[PDB]
């Protein structure tokens, strides 16, 4: 499936997508991308939209 990532860094925002077989795998990809790019914070998932948010 296509999963989405919302990255909220206070006044700064971003977003991205990945293809993955399930949600746990997409989150591993999203958590590495977020961390590689300086974005650390609280994670939540909307399984109705297959969208993760990381909030600084």
Author numbering: 1 to 56
Q: What is the paper's account of this structure, in its own sentences?
A:
Thus, we chose to engineer the loop L1 of the 56-residue immunoglobulin-binding domain B1 of the streptococcal protein G (GB1).35–38 The solvent exposed loop L1 in wild type GB1 is a type-I β-turn with lysine at the i + 1 position and threonine at the i + 2 position that lacks a COi+1 → COi+2 n → π* interaction. However, to have a better control over the turn conformation, we decided to introduce a type-II′ β-turn. Through subsequent X-ray crystallography and computational analysis of synthetic GB1 proteins with amino acid substitutions at the i + 2 residue of the β-turn, we show that amino acid side-chain identity and its rotameric conformation have a direct influence on the strength of an n → π* interaction. Gratifyingly, the thermal denaturation of the GB1 proteins shows a good correlation between their stability and the strength of an n → π* interaction at the β-turn.
With the decreasing helix propensity of amino acids in the order Ala > Ser > Val, we noted an increase in both d and θ between COi+1 → COi+2, suggesting a gradual weakening of the n → π* interaction at the i + 2 residue. Thus, to obtain a quantitative estimate of the n → π* interaction energy (En→π*) at the i + 2 residue in 2, 3, and 4, we resorted to NBO analysis, which clearly indicated a decreasing En→π* in the order 2 > 3 > 4. An overlay of the type-II′ β-turns of both the β-branched amino acids valine and threonine revealed a clear difference in the side-chain rotamer conformation.
